[PDB]
């Protein structure tokens, strides 16, 4: 019942700004300091900011000092992070977190109970993507299985899903009839600012040229839907 | 600001094993050190605070020790729920707080050599000025692997990106893609595209390759 519920992220261009919200309930919100922590894709946790129980005192990490401002509205159980002068390096999942109180103290007992004992409850996280790129559906290209009778039994085929913005894309095979041995890699962010990934699958060699393989690609931000047939490249 | 250094960065263990992960402060922090667990797509979970006291709800197989600058997290009988990334966090310099860089605890299994496949760029993609060449390493263990692109026998560098899946839920293997990106004009002027794979499970590097135009 102690809980933090976040809202308000999304895609923004560099230089622009965003405000993240975090609604608390189930505990006396105004009795506790509150924190923001962020995690860039594939990277570790980085502490962002802290605000004291009644908003009078606050501190921000050097990486965001002068751009981000933590604040709170205790009459509405709300924590905020005002994020200005946004840079591509600020792309991350942002979490709000409540300050943990040492179990042996039911009320505030200065440094005996508060401040030094981590963070016990966390929001679900909000994704913020800072980018110049504009919404763009992907191009889908075949990863055609090789002619070489190599391996014996098993062949690999797939789909290259290139140049889309923003995340995510979903990939299925044969409208869900093919799931075993499917690997859909995490997206990489390309130099262009556009994302790319491949989805591959291993199938019986003998099924090449006798069974149909279709990757079904959907990009909701673009309302892009592609069904790309993948077949051996018939040789001239 | 105080720097927290975790060791090791990655480590493998099986269910039942005992796991120790350490964290060192660049200066004394008394015992004001917390440990967290995190799985992909979820918030971190507080495990231990004040170096040694267990957060309510956290299984007793977790324990912390240490003081001043040297700290350890110990999980005494590894369970399936325990594979995850672990972070230490120092609160001594409150109100500024720093995290360690994290330790990923993955599932140990037998060595498995990757099946390697190479994929040329499609004709459709070429019609738009760019050529992506893909090398796939499938169902291998452990994670460490060396993929070298060679174009007309010349070693490539700075024009490829790798992506690796999460450890597979059923067979504990990894798969990996390496994508070589060239302009159409660059791809057209070369003949032999080769992907050379080095891995523990392979008594010699495996090369897969194609000749442009076959």
């Amino acid at each position: 019942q102690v809980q933090l519920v976040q809202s308000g992220g999304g895609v923004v261009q560099p230089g622009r700004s965003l405000r993240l919200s975090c609604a608390a309930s189930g505990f006396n919100f105004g009795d506790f300091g509150m924190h923001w922590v962020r995690q860039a894709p594939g990277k570790g946790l980085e502490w962002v900011a802290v605000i004291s129980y009644e908003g009078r005192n606050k501190n921000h990490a050097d990486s965001v000092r002068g751009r981000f401002t933590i604040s709170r509205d205790n009459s509405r159980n709300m924590l905020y992070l005002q994020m200005n002068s946004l840079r591509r390096g600020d792309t991350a999942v942002y979490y709000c977190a409540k300050e943990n109180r040492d179990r042996n103290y039911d009320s505030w007992s200065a440094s005996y109970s508060d401040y030094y004992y981590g963070m016990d409850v966390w929001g679900q996280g909000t994704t913020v993507t800072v980018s110049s790129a504009s919404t763009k559906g992907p191009s889908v290209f075949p990863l055609a299985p090789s002619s070489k009778s190599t391996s014996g039994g098993t062949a690999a085929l797939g789909c290259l899903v290139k140049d889309y913005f923003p995340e995510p894309v979903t990939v299925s095979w044969n409208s869900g009839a093919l799931t075993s041995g499917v690997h859909t890699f995490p997206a990489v962010l390309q130099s262009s600012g556009l994302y790319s990934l491949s989805s591959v699958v291993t199938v019986p060699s003998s099924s090449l040229g006798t069974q149909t393989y279709i990757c079904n690609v959907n990009h909701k931000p673009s309302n892009t839907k592609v069904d790309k047939k993948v077949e051996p490249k018939s040789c001239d | 600001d105080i720097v927290m250094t975790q060791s090791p960065s990655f480590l493998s263990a099986s269910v039942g094993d005992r796991v120790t992960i350490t964290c060192r402060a660049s200066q004394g922090i008394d015992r004001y050190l917390a440990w967290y667990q995190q799985k992909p797509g979820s918030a971190p979970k507080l495990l231990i605070y004040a170096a040694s006291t267990l957060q309510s709800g956290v299984p007793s197989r977790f324990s912390g020790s240490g003081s001043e600058t040297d700290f350890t997290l110990t999980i005494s009988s590894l369970q399936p729920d325990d594979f995850a990334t672990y972070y230490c966090q120092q609160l001594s310099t409150y109100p500024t707080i720093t995290f360690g860089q994290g330790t990923r605890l993955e599932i140990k299994r037998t060595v498995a050599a990757p099946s390697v496949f190479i994929f040329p760029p499609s004709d459709e993609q070429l019609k738009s000025g760019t050529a992506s060449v893909v090398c796939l390493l499938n169902n291998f263990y452990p994670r460490e692997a060396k993929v070298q692109w060679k174009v007309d026998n010349a070693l490539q560098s700075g024009n490829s990106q790798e992506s690796v899946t999460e450890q597979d839920s059923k067979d504990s293997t990894y798969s990996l893609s390496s994508t070589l990106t060239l302009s159409k004009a660059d791809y057209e002027k070369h003949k032999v595209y080769a992907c050379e794979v080095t891995h523990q499970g392979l008594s010699s590097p495996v090369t897969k390759s194609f000749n442009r135009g076959e």
Partner: peptide, 15 residues
């Protein structure tokens, strides 16, 4: 007793 306002002011504003 001891004021949280007093102790936190020193904590957040120390050199």
């Amino acid at each position: 007793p001891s004021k949280r306002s007093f102790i936190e002011d020193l904590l957040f504003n120390k050199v």
